[PDB]
Amino acid sequence: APAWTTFRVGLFCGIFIVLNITLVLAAVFKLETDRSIWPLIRIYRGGFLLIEFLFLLGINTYGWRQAGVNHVLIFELNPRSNLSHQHLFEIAGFLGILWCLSLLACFFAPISVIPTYVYPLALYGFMVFFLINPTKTFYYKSRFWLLKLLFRVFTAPFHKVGFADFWLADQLNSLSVILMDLEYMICFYSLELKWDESKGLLPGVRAIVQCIPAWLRFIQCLRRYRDTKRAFPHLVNAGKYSTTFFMVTFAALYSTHKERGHSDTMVFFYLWIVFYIISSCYTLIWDLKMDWGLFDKNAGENTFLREEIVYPQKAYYYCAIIEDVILRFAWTIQISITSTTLLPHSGDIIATVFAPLEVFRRFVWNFFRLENEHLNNCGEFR
Amino acid sequence: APAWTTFRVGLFCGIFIVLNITLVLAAVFKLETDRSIWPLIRIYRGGFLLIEFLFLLGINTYGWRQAGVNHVLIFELNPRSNLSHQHLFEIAGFLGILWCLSLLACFFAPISVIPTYVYPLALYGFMVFFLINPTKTFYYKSRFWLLKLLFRVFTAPFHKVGFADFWLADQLNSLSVILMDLEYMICFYSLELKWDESKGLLPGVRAIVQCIPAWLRFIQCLRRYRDTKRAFPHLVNAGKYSTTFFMVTFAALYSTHKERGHSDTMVFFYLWIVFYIISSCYTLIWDLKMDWGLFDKNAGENTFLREEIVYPQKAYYYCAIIEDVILRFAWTIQISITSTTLLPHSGDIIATVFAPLEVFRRFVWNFFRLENEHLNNCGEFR
Numbered sequence: 001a002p003a004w005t006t007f008r009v010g011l012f013c014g015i016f017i018v019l020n021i022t023l024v025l026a027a028v029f030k031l032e033t034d035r036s037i038w039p040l041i042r043i044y045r046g047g048f049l050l051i052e053f054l055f056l057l058g059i060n061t062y063g064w065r066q067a068g069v070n071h072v073l074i075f076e077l078n079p080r081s082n083l084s085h086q087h088l089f090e091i092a093g094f095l096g097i098l099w100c101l102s103l104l105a106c107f108f109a110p111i112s113v114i115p116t117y118v119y120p121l122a123l124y125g126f127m128v129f130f131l132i133n134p135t136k137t138f139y140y141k142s143r144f145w146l147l148k149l150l151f152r153v154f155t156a157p158f159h160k161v162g163f164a165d166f167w168l169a170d171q172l173n174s175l176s177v178i179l180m181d182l183e184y185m186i187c188f189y190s191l192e193l194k195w196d197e198s199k200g201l202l203p204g205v206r207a208i209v210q211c212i213p214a215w216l217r218f219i220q221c222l223r224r225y226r227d228t229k230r231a232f233p234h235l236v237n238a239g240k241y242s243t244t245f246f247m248v249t250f251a252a253l254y255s256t257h258k259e260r261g262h263s264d265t266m267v268f269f270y271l272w273i274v275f276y277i278i279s280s281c282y283t284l285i286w287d288l289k290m291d292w293g294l295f296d297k298n299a300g301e302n303t304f305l306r307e308e309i310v311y312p313q314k315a316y317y318y319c320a321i322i323e324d325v326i327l328r329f330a331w332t333i334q335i336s337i338t339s340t341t342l343l344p345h346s347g348d349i350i351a352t353v354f355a356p357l358e359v360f361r362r363f364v365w366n367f368f369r370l371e372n373e374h375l376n377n378c379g380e381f382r
Numbered sequence: 383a384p385a386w387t388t389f390r391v392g393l394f395c396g397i398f399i400v401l402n403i404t405l406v407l408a409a410v411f412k413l414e415t416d417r418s419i420w421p422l423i424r425i426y427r428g429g430f431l432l433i434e435f436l437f438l439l440g441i442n443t444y445g446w447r448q449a450g451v452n453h454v455l456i457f458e459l460n461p462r463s464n465l466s467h468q469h470l471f472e473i474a475g476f477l478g479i480l481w482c483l484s485l486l487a488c489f490f491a492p493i494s495v496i497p498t499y500v501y502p503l504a505l506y507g508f509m510v511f512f513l514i515n516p517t518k519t520f521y522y523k524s525r526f527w528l529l530k531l532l533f534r535v536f537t538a539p540f541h542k543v544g545f546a547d548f549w550l551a552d553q554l555n556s557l558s559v560i561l562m563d564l565e566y567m568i569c570f571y572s573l574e575l576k577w578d579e580s581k582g583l584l585p586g587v588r589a590i591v592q593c594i595p596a597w598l599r600f601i602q603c604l605r606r607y608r609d610t611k612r613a614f615p616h617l618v619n620a621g622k623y624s625t626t627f628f629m630v631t632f633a634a635l636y637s638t639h640k641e642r643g644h645s646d647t648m649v650f651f652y653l654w655i656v657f658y659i660i661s662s663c664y665t666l667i668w669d670l671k672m673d674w675g676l677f678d679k680n681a682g683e684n685t686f687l688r689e690e691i692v693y694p695q696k697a698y699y700y701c702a703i704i705e706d707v708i709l710r711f712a713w714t715i716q717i718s719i720t721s722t723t724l725l726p727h728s729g730d731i732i733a734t735v736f737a738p739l740e741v742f743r744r745f746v747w748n749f750f751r752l753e754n755e756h757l758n759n760c761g762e763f764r
């Protein structure tokens with residue numbers, strides 16, 4: 001990669017570090033004292049997750065470059081002009097600079113007129129303008145490819161399902177915090193926000209929104225079967241996402257009938273518990289045995305894993321498996337707490353702590369799924 | 383292709399940028415009108431100009447390797463272990479981060495311990511600690527080379543004379559102000575300071591030390607004459623540097639008699655004026671005729687330049703010449719004002735603005751003097 005790309009990577013990383021430190025210092029000592037900044041958090045976290053996601057994705061590319069598995073051919077990208085890890089770090093650093101500047105603007109509102117509202121709006125609007133921009137400024141091929149994929153994924157099962165479409169729809173299942181907080185921003189600006197004089201911060205459908213990343217995968221797998229006529233792995237995956245469907249549904253039912261009479265709420269709680277267990281076990285075993293391709297009985301050495309090991313040492317696998325076993329339950333409880341008022345106490349703190357763990361599990365799952373899709377060719381994309 | 387080194391260069395550049403922005407924003411946010419920044423800036427500009435010179439020298443090395451300058455053959459040096467512009471950039475950025483941290487700590491003073499006046503010394507000590515430390519690291523070879531040339535430069539003709547020591551001594555003329563800064567530090571830390579308060583302030587020897595960079599070159603020219611028994615240009619150069627002695631002498635006399643109010647005050651003024659004029663024109667013609675080797679007869683299509691320009695555009699040279707014809711005068715004016723007490727009003731801003739301009743003039747002067755030396759060997763170093 002050219003030296004100027006690395007220079008911009010370093011510049012953006014250093015600005016990111018300094019802005020992180022000054023955000024910590026500003027948020028710990030003198031920001032508002034008594035503000036209850038929690039709504040602000042919900043506005044920013046998902047966007048931050050995106051930055052984090054991109055950052056993590058860059059590392060993944062590095063691995064997929066150092067392992068050099070198939071990344072050019074699996075995603076069916078162009079054989080030339082493919083983004084490297086440094087380019088992902090560049091974009092992530094630019095977005096992090098914008099995010100930190102918006103956060104500092106929120107904490108230092110006297111920076112300009114039109115306080116508060118515009119800054120998160122400005123950040124996300126700038127991220128959208130960078131995304132959809134036919135001016136062909138910088139990496140226009142990448143942004144256009146992402147735009148084309150989003151239509152093929154976020155819309156419906158009408159489109160053909162490919163590896164890239166499946167991958168994006170799948171990792172939306174882990175960064176769906178942004179989808180939740182987008183509707184949260186809409187509602188908060190609509191109703192919760194004072195939005196009358198200045199600096200106003202006061203010192204049902206969400207269940208549907210939570211299932212959109214699950215609905216997309218369910219209908220994608222249904223389309224896969226409809227054009228496949230051979231549901232060896234497909235209906236299993238549909239059941240896997242229907243477990244999330246049921247867990248979200250009964251979480252919503254419990255949070256609705258807890259405070260509205262209906263003393264049979266203990267039945268809903270037991271159903272929630274059993275569906276939590278079922279979804280966690282289903283997703284975990286699907287990841288371990290058939291998604292990552294581990295636990296292969298044909299393997300002779302390096303038990304609990306498969307015959308062929310791309311990565312340098314088996315130590316990366318067992319720690320990852322333990323962390324994934326923890327983070328599967330983390331995600332399972334997260335997508336239930338963020339959906340509705342399951343836990344009146346805390347919850348938001350839990351959601352903010354747990355979301356980066358979901359993106360972390362995505363970061364390792366990308367490694368393992370991509371390195372699995374070189375020999376087994378799961379999903380038969382070929 | 384030092385990719386990680388380029389990354390570190392960018393990281394340090396970004397941290398320095400954000401720290402400088404924080405400095406400029408805290409200067410107009412914190413501090414009080416009755417607490418003038420003049421002591422703090424008179425302490426810190428010594429390191430500020432050092433960092434500026436180091437970064438400009440990195441640019442100088444980059445430009446030298448860009449087109450036609452070989453600052454290895456005639457620079458002493460080793461043709462296999464030279465410092466590149468990346469390394470100079472990294473060193474400048476590292477010292478800039480340390481300087482910015484020191485200045486910010488002096489601005490805020492988060493803790494009642496480690497008084498404000500302790501922060502600069504450590505940095506300067508750290509600067510010394512980057513050279514005197516014998517641990518073979520941090521480009522130990524270059525640090526040892528610098529400390530082995532700071533002896534051949536800062537001493538008397540007891541040593542020999544070459545290109546490297548002559549150049550290092552010449553840079554001292556542009557860096558004379560920081561020497562005064564060091565002097566000021568001592569005068570700050572010996573005579574006027576309230577050691578019982580953590581705040582940094584309260585709401586003829588200098589004229590001699592000012593000539594030290596001039597003496598180190600005058601006596602070195604005399605050494606060259608004693609060696610080669612060559613009248614021109616060694617004695618001409620000696621006169622050019624003794625013009626500094628004459629200028630400072632008459633400026634000091636005029637200022638001293640101005641405050642003392644004696645009848646011989648006005649007589650020295652015209653002598654100071656004429657010596658200023660002759661000194662400025664002397665250094666000017668030395669720069670534009672023998673330093674840079676311009677105004678050459680039968681040079682060719684080049685206007686006012688010599689036969690060989692090497693550098694891409696002719697316009698550069700003309701700009702340089704114009705800037706030189708300005709900056710030298712400012713430079714000479716600076717020598718008048720910083721040292722002697724003449725016209726205490728203003729001057730401080732004059733010094734703090736013209737000193738970086740002096741370093742910029744030295745930057746261009748390094749750009750062209752080494753070119754002249756490479757093209758037509760001057761100072762008889764062949």
Ligand SMILES: CCCCCCCCCCCCCCCCCC(=O)OC[C@H](COP(=O)([O-])OCC[N+](C)(C)C)OC(=O)CCCCCCCCCCCCCCCCC
Nearest residue numbers: 006009013016051052055059062086089092093385386389
């Ligand atoms: C070291 C002590 C202090 C540590 C402080 C930080 C610790 C906290 C944990 C950070 C983990 C960082 C891991 C990723 C970086 C290394 C990845 C890698 O493979 O690099 C090798 C890569 C590639 O290595 P390479 O180029 O040597 O490999 C090929 C070289 N040849 C061809 C010659 C063989 O390194 C680079 O040169 C790339 C650019 C620099 C490394 C990227 C750093 C970016 C840091 C961004 C941070 C902030 C932005 C986003 C943050 C968002 C989250 C909030």
Ligand SMILES: CCCCCCCCCCCCCCCCCC(=O)OC[C@H](COP(=O)([O-])OCC[N+](C)(C)C)OC(=O)CCCCCCCCCCCCCCCCC
Nearest residue numbers: 077078081082083091124127128130131141142143145146
């Ligand atoms: C409305 C809600 C929207 C929610 C989702 C928002 C977008 C989420 C995107 C997640 C994945 C992003 C990276 C995927 C591709 C990277 C992996 C890879 O190696 O592929 C190479 C690809 C292609 O790069 P390439 O250089 O290899 O190109 C290949 C060459 N062609 C195209 C000819 C085949 O890399 C990318 O596309 C990455 C660059 C784009 C990164 C995103 C830009 C900024 C993100 C802002 C998103 C908007 C947030 C919305 C906020 C609220 C809106 C109201």
Ligand SMILES: CCCCCCCCCCCCCCCCCC(=O)OC[C@H](COP(=O)([O-])OCC[N+](C)(C)C)OC(=O)CCCCCCCCCCCCCCCCC
Nearest residue numbers: 459460463464465466473506509510512523524525527528
């Ligand atoms: C007592 C008064 C002290 C006054 C000190 C004035 C400043 C001295 C340091 C600045 C001059 C150095 C740059 C000029 C030479 C560059 C030549 C070149 O291109 O080669 C690169 C040279 C060597 O290049 P190289 O290593 O690539 O070449 C190979 C060399 N040999 C032959 C040995 C293999 O390296 C440097 O100049 C960089 C070294 C770091 C310099 C800065 C260190 C930290 C700053 C502290 C300075 C002191 C501050 C004092 C403040 C007050 C203290 C009380």
Ligand SMILES: CCCCCCCCCCCCCCCCCC(=O)OC[C@H](COP(=O)([O-])OCC[N+](C)(C)C)OC(=O)CCCCCCCCCCCCCCCCC
Nearest residue numbers: 003004007388391392395398433434437444471474475478
């Ligand atoms: C944004 C505002 C710009 C103007 C503000 C005024 C300051 C000047 C800003 C920099 C102007 C250009 C300088 C570098 C010119 C190009 C050099 C080069 O080759 O770069 C390529 C290098 C990388 O090397 P490279 O190997 O890519 O070299 C390019 C040539 N090839 C590829 C063919 C070999 O890029 C950099 O890393 C440049 C660093 C940024 C510029 C300098 C800042 C860092 C060092 C100083 C830190 C701050 C302390 C001192 C600041 C001043 C006093 C307070």
